[PDB]
Design a protein around this ligand. Structure first.
Ligand SMILES: OC[C@H]1O[C@@H](O[C@H]2[C@H](O)[C@H](O)[C@H](O)O[C@@H]2CO)[C@@H](O)[C@@H](O)[C@@H]1O
Ligand SMILES: [Cl-]
Length: 407
Protein backbone atom coordinates (compact mmCIF):
# COMPACT_ATOMS: atom_id res chain seq x y z
CA UNK A 1 0.00 0.00 0.00
CA UNK A 2 3.00 2.24 -0.54
CA UNK A 3 2.67 5.32 -2.71
CA UNK A 4 6.06 5.43 -4.43
CA UNK A 5 7.17 7.57 -7.38
CA UNK A 6 7.86 5.37 -10.34
CA UNK A 7 11.33 4.11 -11.10
CA UNK A 8 11.90 6.58 -13.92
CA UNK A 9 11.31 9.55 -11.64
CA UNK A 10 13.39 8.21 -8.75
CA UNK A 11 16.29 7.38 -11.07
CA UNK A 12 16.01 10.70 -12.93
CA UNK A 13 16.19 12.67 -9.68
CA UNK A 14 19.04 10.50 -8.42
CA UNK A 15 20.99 11.08 -11.64
CA UNK A 16 20.49 14.86 -11.52
CA UNK A 17 21.58 14.94 -7.88
CA UNK A 18 24.69 12.89 -8.65
CA UNK A 19 25.51 15.17 -11.59
CA UNK A 20 25.03 18.26 -9.45
CA UNK A 21 27.30 16.88 -6.74
CA UNK A 22 30.11 15.61 -8.94
CA UNK A 23 30.01 17.89 -11.98
CA UNK A 24 29.17 21.16 -10.19
CA UNK A 25 29.72 21.20 -6.41
CA UNK A 26 32.73 18.94 -5.88
CA UNK A 27 34.31 20.04 -9.17
CA UNK A 28 34.16 23.66 -8.02
CA UNK A 29 35.67 22.83 -4.64
CA UNK A 30 38.41 20.59 -6.02
CA UNK A 31 39.49 23.05 -8.72
CA UNK A 32 38.85 26.56 -7.37
CA UNK A 33 39.66 26.36 -3.69
CA UNK A 34 42.90 24.36 -3.05
CA UNK A 35 45.69 26.81 -2.24
CA UNK A 36 49.21 25.96 -3.46
CA UNK A 37 50.80 28.89 -1.57
CA UNK A 38 49.86 28.06 2.04
CA UNK A 39 48.54 24.55 1.45
CA UNK A 40 45.03 23.53 2.35
CA UNK A 41 42.15 25.60 1.01
CA UNK A 42 41.38 29.28 0.52
CA UNK A 43 39.23 30.98 3.15
CA UNK A 44 37.22 33.05 0.70
CA UNK A 45 36.08 33.00 -2.92
CA UNK A 46 34.49 36.23 -4.13
CA UNK A 47 31.24 36.54 -6.08
CA UNK A 48 33.35 36.79 -9.24
CA UNK A 49 34.84 33.38 -8.48
CA UNK A 50 38.26 34.75 -7.54
CA UNK A 51 39.90 32.79 -4.71
CA UNK A 52 41.62 34.67 -1.90
CA UNK A 53 44.51 32.54 -0.60
CA UNK A 54 45.57 35.25 1.86
CA UNK A 55 42.16 35.54 3.55
CA UNK A 56 41.84 34.30 7.14
CA UNK A 57 40.61 30.72 7.33
CA UNK A 58 37.89 29.40 9.60
CA UNK A 59 37.94 26.07 11.41
CA UNK A 60 34.30 25.41 10.57
CA UNK A 61 34.91 25.92 6.85
CA UNK A 62 37.96 23.67 6.85
CA UNK A 63 36.23 20.96 8.87
CA UNK A 64 33.38 21.17 6.39
CA UNK A 65 35.77 20.68 3.49
CA UNK A 66 37.29 17.67 5.25
CA UNK A 67 33.91 16.15 6.07
CA UNK A 68 32.51 16.59 2.56
CA UNK A 69 35.41 15.13 0.62
CA UNK A 70 35.74 12.35 3.21
CA UNK A 71 32.06 11.46 2.89
CA UNK A 72 32.12 11.74 -0.90
CA UNK A 73 35.18 9.50 -1.05
CA UNK A 74 33.52 6.97 1.25
CA UNK A 75 30.30 6.86 -0.74
CA UNK A 76 31.58 7.32 -4.31
CA UNK A 77 35.17 6.07 -4.23
CA UNK A 78 36.61 8.77 -6.51
CA UNK A 79 40.35 9.05 -5.75
CA UNK A 80 40.37 12.84 -6.17
CA UNK A 81 38.00 13.08 -3.19
CA UNK A 82 40.41 11.16 -0.97
CA UNK A 83 43.20 13.46 -2.16
CA UNK A 84 41.19 16.58 -1.32
CA UNK A 85 40.14 15.23 2.07
CA UNK A 86 43.78 14.39 2.84
CA UNK A 87 44.77 17.93 1.85
CA UNK A 88 42.16 19.34 4.20
CA UNK A 89 43.11 16.93 7.00
CA UNK A 90 46.81 17.75 6.89
CA UNK A 91 46.28 21.52 7.04
CA UNK A 92 43.67 21.02 9.77
CA UNK A 93 45.93 19.00 12.07
CA UNK A 94 48.94 21.27 11.45
CA UNK A 95 47.25 24.60 12.09
CA UNK A 96 43.73 24.38 13.51
CA UNK A 97 44.47 21.78 16.18
CA UNK A 98 45.87 23.32 19.36
CA UNK A 99 48.58 20.85 20.36
CA UNK A 100 48.99 22.53 23.76
CA UNK A 101 45.45 22.97 25.09
CA UNK A 102 43.58 20.69 22.66
CA UNK A 103 40.62 21.42 20.42
CA UNK A 104 40.65 23.65 17.35
CA UNK A 105 41.15 27.39 17.01
CA UNK A 106 38.32 29.50 15.61
CA UNK A 107 40.36 31.21 12.88
CA UNK A 108 43.92 31.05 11.58
CA UNK A 109 45.81 33.26 9.21
CA UNK A 110 46.26 31.86 5.71
CA UNK A 111 49.77 30.74 6.64
CA UNK A 112 48.37 28.85 9.64
CA UNK A 113 49.24 31.23 12.47
CA UNK A 114 46.43 31.38 15.05
CA UNK A 115 44.35 34.56 14.72
CA UNK A 116 41.31 33.83 16.91
CA UNK A 117 42.15 31.16 19.47
CA UNK A 118 38.77 30.84 21.16
CA UNK A 119 37.50 27.27 21.54
CA UNK A 120 33.89 27.46 20.35
CA UNK A 121 31.89 24.29 20.92
CA UNK A 122 30.34 24.73 17.47
CA UNK A 123 33.80 24.59 15.92
CA UNK A 124 34.85 21.71 18.22
CA UNK A 125 31.76 19.81 17.07
CA UNK A 126 32.51 20.27 13.39
CA UNK A 127 36.05 19.04 14.05
CA UNK A 128 34.67 15.89 15.69
CA UNK A 129 32.18 15.47 12.84
CA UNK A 130 34.83 15.80 10.13
CA UNK A 131 37.54 13.79 11.88
CA UNK A 132 35.12 10.94 12.60
CA UNK A 133 34.03 10.94 8.95
CA UNK A 134 37.66 10.86 7.81
CA UNK A 135 38.20 7.90 10.13
CA UNK A 136 35.09 6.25 8.68
CA UNK A 137 36.47 6.75 5.16
CA UNK A 138 40.06 5.60 5.82
CA UNK A 139 40.28 3.78 9.14
CA UNK A 140 42.85 6.37 10.24
CA UNK A 141 43.69 5.94 13.91
CA UNK A 142 45.01 9.49 14.40
CA UNK A 143 41.80 11.09 13.12
CA UNK A 144 39.67 9.06 15.55
CA UNK A 145 42.05 9.70 18.45
CA UNK A 146 41.82 13.44 17.78
CA UNK A 147 38.03 13.36 17.63
CA UNK A 148 37.92 11.50 20.93
CA UNK A 149 40.22 14.06 22.56
CA UNK A 150 38.02 16.97 21.46
CA UNK A 151 34.93 15.15 22.76
CA UNK A 152 36.69 14.73 26.11
CA UNK A 153 37.52 18.45 26.19
CA UNK A 154 33.93 19.46 25.45
CA UNK A 155 32.65 17.28 28.28
CA UNK A 156 35.42 18.30 30.69
CA UNK A 157 35.25 22.06 30.20
CA UNK A 158 31.75 22.85 28.84
CA UNK A 159 29.14 20.34 30.02
CA UNK A 160 26.43 21.81 32.23
CA UNK A 161 25.66 18.78 34.35
CA UNK A 162 22.90 20.50 36.35
CA UNK A 163 20.67 21.80 33.57
CA UNK A 164 21.80 19.87 30.50
CA UNK A 165 23.70 20.91 27.42
CA UNK A 166 26.88 22.93 27.21
CA UNK A 167 28.57 26.24 27.71
CA UNK A 168 29.18 27.15 24.10
CA UNK A 169 32.46 29.09 24.01
CA UNK A 170 35.76 29.15 25.88
CA UNK A 171 39.04 30.93 25.37
CA UNK A 172 42.13 29.10 24.12
CA UNK A 173 42.83 27.52 27.51
CA UNK A 174 39.17 26.44 27.86
CA UNK A 175 38.00 29.12 30.28
CA UNK A 176 34.34 29.96 29.52
CA UNK A 177 33.50 33.22 27.77
CA UNK A 178 30.38 35.33 28.20
CA UNK A 179 29.94 36.02 24.47
CA UNK A 180 29.06 32.69 22.86
CA UNK A 181 27.73 34.26 19.66
CA UNK A 182 28.82 32.61 16.44
CA UNK A 183 28.28 35.92 14.63
CA UNK A 184 26.61 39.31 15.01
CA UNK A 185 23.36 37.69 13.80
CA UNK A 186 23.10 35.58 16.94
CA UNK A 187 21.33 36.54 20.14
CA UNK A 188 23.68 37.26 23.10
CA UNK A 189 22.28 34.36 25.14
CA UNK A 190 24.11 31.52 26.92
CA UNK A 191 22.44 28.63 25.08
CA UNK A 192 21.60 28.21 21.43
CA UNK A 193 19.82 25.48 19.49
CA UNK A 194 22.35 25.89 16.68
CA UNK A 195 25.41 24.95 18.68
CA UNK A 196 23.59 22.14 20.45
CA UNK A 197 22.32 20.76 17.14
CA UNK A 198 25.86 20.42 15.85
CA UNK A 199 27.08 18.86 19.10
CA UNK A 200 24.41 16.22 18.52
CA UNK A 201 25.44 15.88 14.88
CA UNK A 202 29.11 15.44 15.83
CA UNK A 203 28.39 13.00 18.66
CA UNK A 204 26.20 10.84 16.44
CA UNK A 205 28.96 10.55 13.84
CA UNK A 206 31.57 9.85 16.52
CA UNK A 207 29.38 7.17 18.08
CA UNK A 208 28.99 5.43 14.72
CA UNK A 209 32.75 4.81 14.61
CA UNK A 210 33.34 4.68 18.40
CA UNK A 211 30.32 3.31 20.31
CA UNK A 212 31.53 4.25 23.79
CA UNK A 213 29.02 3.75 26.61
CA UNK A 214 29.41 7.22 28.14
CA UNK A 215 29.12 8.84 24.71
CA UNK A 216 25.86 6.96 24.18
CA UNK A 217 24.57 8.55 27.40
CA UNK A 218 25.70 12.03 26.33
CA UNK A 219 24.12 11.59 22.91
CA UNK A 220 20.84 10.34 24.38
CA UNK A 221 20.85 13.29 26.80
CA UNK A 222 21.17 15.67 23.84
CA UNK A 223 18.25 14.01 22.02
CA UNK A 224 16.23 14.25 25.22
CA UNK A 225 17.19 17.91 25.58
CA UNK A 226 15.90 18.67 22.08
CA UNK A 227 12.61 16.89 22.83
CA UNK A 228 12.08 18.54 26.22
CA UNK A 229 13.51 22.04 25.80
CA UNK A 230 14.19 23.02 22.18
CA UNK A 231 11.43 21.51 20.06
CA UNK A 232 8.18 23.42 20.68
CA UNK A 233 5.20 21.12 20.12
CA UNK A 234 2.77 24.05 20.05
CA UNK A 235 4.37 25.51 16.91
CA UNK A 236 6.42 22.76 15.27
CA UNK A 237 9.53 24.95 15.35
CA UNK A 238 12.79 24.89 17.24
CA UNK A 239 13.33 27.57 19.86
CA UNK A 240 16.62 29.22 18.94
CA UNK A 241 18.10 30.74 22.13
CA UNK A 242 17.80 30.15 25.86
CA UNK A 243 19.22 30.99 29.24
CA UNK A 244 21.21 28.36 31.16
CA UNK A 245 18.06 26.65 32.47
CA UNK A 246 16.67 26.42 28.91
CA UNK A 247 14.12 29.17 29.42
CA UNK A 248 13.27 30.51 25.94
CA UNK A 249 15.05 33.75 25.10
CA UNK A 250 13.92 34.10 21.48
CA UNK A 251 10.83 33.83 19.33
CA UNK A 252 12.54 33.71 15.93
CA UNK A 253 12.01 30.75 13.61
CA UNK A 254 14.67 29.19 11.38
CA UNK A 255 13.00 27.00 8.77
CA UNK A 256 16.32 25.58 7.60
CA UNK A 257 17.29 24.49 11.10
CA UNK A 258 13.84 22.98 11.67
CA UNK A 259 14.07 20.78 8.59
CA UNK A 260 17.76 19.96 9.26
CA UNK A 261 16.96 18.91 12.81
CA UNK A 262 14.02 16.88 11.54
CA UNK A 263 16.33 14.37 9.90
CA UNK A 264 19.41 14.75 12.13
CA UNK A 265 17.46 13.89 15.29
CA UNK A 266 16.33 10.62 13.73
CA UNK A 267 19.84 9.88 12.50
CA UNK A 268 21.06 10.33 16.08
CA UNK A 269 18.45 8.05 17.68
CA UNK A 270 19.09 5.38 15.03
CA UNK A 271 22.85 5.51 15.56
CA UNK A 272 22.10 4.78 19.22
CA UNK A 273 19.61 2.08 18.28
CA UNK A 274 17.40 3.69 20.94
CA UNK A 275 14.09 2.14 19.93
CA UNK A 276 12.31 3.37 23.08
CA UNK A 277 13.10 7.02 22.24
CA UNK A 278 12.41 6.71 18.52
CA UNK A 279 8.57 7.15 18.61
CA UNK A 280 8.82 10.55 20.29
CA UNK A 281 11.67 11.63 18.02
CA UNK A 282 9.85 10.54 14.86
CA UNK A 283 6.78 12.46 16.02
CA UNK A 284 8.79 15.63 16.60
CA UNK A 285 10.72 15.05 13.37
CA UNK A 286 7.57 14.71 11.27
CA UNK A 287 6.08 17.75 13.00
CA UNK A 288 9.11 19.89 12.16
CA UNK A 289 8.87 18.72 8.57
CA UNK A 290 5.13 19.49 8.34
CA UNK A 291 5.58 22.90 9.95
CA UNK A 292 8.31 23.64 7.41
CA UNK A 293 6.08 22.43 4.57
CA UNK A 294 3.17 24.61 5.68
CA UNK A 295 4.93 27.76 6.87
CA UNK A 296 8.47 27.91 5.55
CA UNK A 297 7.96 27.61 1.81
CA UNK A 298 7.49 29.99 -1.08
CA UNK A 299 4.97 28.98 -3.77
CA UNK A 300 7.88 27.62 -5.84
CA UNK A 301 8.67 25.18 -3.00
CA UNK A 302 11.90 26.85 -1.92
CA UNK A 303 12.45 27.67 1.75
CA UNK A 304 12.34 31.16 3.20
CA UNK A 305 15.16 32.07 5.58
CA UNK A 306 13.59 32.98 8.92
CA UNK A 307 10.94 34.74 10.87
CA UNK A 308 12.88 37.25 12.93
CA UNK A 309 12.41 38.32 16.53
CA UNK A 310 9.97 41.06 15.50
CA UNK A 311 8.07 38.73 13.18
CA UNK A 312 9.55 39.83 9.86
CA UNK A 313 9.65 37.11 7.21
CA UNK A 314 13.06 37.06 5.51
CA UNK A 315 12.13 35.76 2.06
CA UNK A 316 15.71 35.38 0.86
CA UNK A 317 16.53 31.86 -0.31
CA UNK A 318 19.80 30.97 1.35
CA UNK A 319 21.58 28.02 -0.18
CA UNK A 320 21.71 25.75 2.85
CA UNK A 321 17.99 25.66 3.85
CA UNK A 322 17.29 24.38 0.34
CA UNK A 323 19.88 21.63 0.76
CA UNK A 324 18.55 20.72 4.19
CA UNK A 325 14.99 20.67 2.87
CA UNK A 326 16.01 18.26 0.12
CA UNK A 327 17.20 15.80 2.75
CA UNK A 328 14.54 16.54 5.34
CA UNK A 329 11.64 16.20 2.91
CA UNK A 330 13.03 12.96 1.46
CA UNK A 331 13.53 11.75 5.03
CA UNK A 332 9.97 12.66 5.99
CA UNK A 333 8.75 10.72 2.97
CA UNK A 334 10.77 7.69 4.06
CA UNK A 335 9.50 7.91 7.64
CA UNK A 336 5.82 8.56 6.93
CA UNK A 337 5.24 7.11 3.48
CA UNK A 338 3.40 10.34 2.63
CA UNK A 339 4.31 11.13 -0.96
CA UNK A 340 3.51 14.83 -0.45
CA UNK A 341 6.97 14.99 1.14
CA UNK A 342 8.55 13.50 -1.97
CA UNK A 343 6.72 16.09 -4.06
CA UNK A 344 8.12 18.77 -1.75
CA UNK A 345 11.64 17.37 -2.13
CA UNK A 346 11.24 17.40 -5.90
CA UNK A 347 10.03 21.01 -5.83
CA UNK A 348 12.98 22.21 -3.76
CA UNK A 349 15.32 20.31 -6.09
CA UNK A 350 13.80 22.04 -9.10
CA UNK A 351 14.31 25.35 -7.33
CA UNK A 352 17.93 24.42 -6.60
CA UNK A 353 18.51 23.56 -10.25
CA UNK A 354 16.67 26.52 -11.73
CA UNK A 355 17.57 29.29 -9.27
CA UNK A 356 20.00 28.44 -6.48
CA UNK A 357 22.81 26.82 -8.44
CA UNK A 358 25.13 29.18 -10.32
CA UNK A 359 25.48 27.52 -13.71
CA UNK A 360 27.78 30.24 -15.08
CA UNK A 361 30.10 30.66 -12.09
CA UNK A 362 29.80 27.20 -10.55
CA UNK A 363 28.63 25.98 -7.15
CA UNK A 364 25.49 27.53 -5.64
CA UNK A 365 24.59 31.14 -4.93
CA UNK A 366 24.64 31.86 -1.21
CA UNK A 367 21.38 33.83 -1.48
CA UNK A 368 18.65 34.40 -4.04
CA UNK A 369 16.15 37.23 -3.52
CA UNK A 370 12.39 36.65 -3.62
CA UNK A 371 12.23 38.12 -7.13
CA UNK A 372 14.88 35.68 -8.39
CA UNK A 373 17.88 38.02 -8.27
CA UNK A 374 21.05 36.35 -6.96
CA UNK A 375 22.84 38.45 -4.38
CA UNK A 376 26.54 39.19 -5.07
CA UNK A 377 27.69 37.30 -1.97
CA UNK A 378 30.96 35.43 -1.66
CA UNK A 379 30.86 31.92 -3.11
CA UNK A 380 33.10 30.62 -0.32
CA UNK A 381 33.64 32.19 3.07
CA UNK A 382 33.75 31.48 6.80
CA UNK A 383 30.16 30.24 6.72
CA UNK A 384 29.83 28.80 3.19
CA UNK A 385 31.55 25.48 2.60
CA UNK A 386 30.69 22.32 0.65
CA UNK A 387 28.99 20.56 3.55
CA UNK A 388 25.31 21.52 3.47
CA UNK A 389 24.90 21.08 -0.27
CA UNK A 390 27.47 18.28 -0.60
CA UNK A 391 25.89 16.31 2.23
CA UNK A 392 22.40 16.96 0.89
CA UNK A 393 23.34 15.45 -2.48
CA UNK A 394 25.07 12.48 -0.87
CA UNK A 395 22.07 11.86 1.39
CA UNK A 396 19.57 12.16 -1.46
CA UNK A 397 21.58 9.77 -3.64
CA UNK A 398 21.62 7.11 -0.90
CA UNK A 399 17.99 7.61 0.08
CA UNK A 400 16.89 7.39 -3.55
CA UNK A 401 19.01 4.25 -3.88
CA UNK A 402 17.12 2.68 -0.98
CA UNK A 403 13.76 3.72 -2.44
CA UNK A 404 14.76 2.28 -5.81
CA UNK A 405 15.36 -1.08 -4.08
CA UNK A 406 11.74 -1.32 -2.90
CA UNK A 407 10.82 -2.61 -6.37
O1 LIG B 1 24.43 32.54 13.03
C1 LIG B 1 25.67 31.90 12.69
C2 LIG B 1 25.83 31.77 11.18
O2 LIG B 1 24.89 30.86 10.63
C3 LIG B 1 25.22 30.52 9.29
O3 LIG B 1 24.35 29.48 8.84
C4 LIG B 1 24.74 28.23 9.41
C5 LIG B 1 23.66 27.88 10.42
O4 LIG B 1 23.78 28.74 11.56
C6 LIG B 1 23.71 26.42 10.86
O5 LIG B 1 24.77 26.04 11.74
C7 LIG B 1 23.79 25.57 9.63
O6 LIG B 1 23.44 24.25 10.13
O7 LIG B 1 25.08 25.84 8.96
C8 LIG B 1 24.84 27.14 8.34
C9 LIG B 1 25.73 27.52 7.14
O8 LIG B 1 26.95 28.13 7.56
C10 LIG B 1 25.06 31.75 8.40
O9 LIG B 1 23.69 32.18 8.38
C11 LIG B 1 25.94 32.86 8.95
O10 LIG B 1 25.70 34.05 8.21
C12 LIG B 1 25.65 33.08 10.43
O11 LIG B 1 26.54 34.09 10.92
CL1 LIG C 1 28.54 24.47 4.17
Amino acid sequence: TETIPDVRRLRALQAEVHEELTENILKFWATRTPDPVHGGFVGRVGPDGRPHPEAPRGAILNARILWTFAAAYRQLGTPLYREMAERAYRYFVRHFVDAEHGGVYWMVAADGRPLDTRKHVYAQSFAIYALSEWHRATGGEAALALARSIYDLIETHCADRVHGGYVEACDRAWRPLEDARLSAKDAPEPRSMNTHLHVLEAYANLYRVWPETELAARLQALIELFLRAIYHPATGHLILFFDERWRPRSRAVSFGHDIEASWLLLEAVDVLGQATLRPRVQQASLHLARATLAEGRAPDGSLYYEIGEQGHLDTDRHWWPQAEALVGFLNAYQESGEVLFYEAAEDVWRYIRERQRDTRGGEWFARVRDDGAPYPDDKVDFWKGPYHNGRACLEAIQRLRHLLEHV
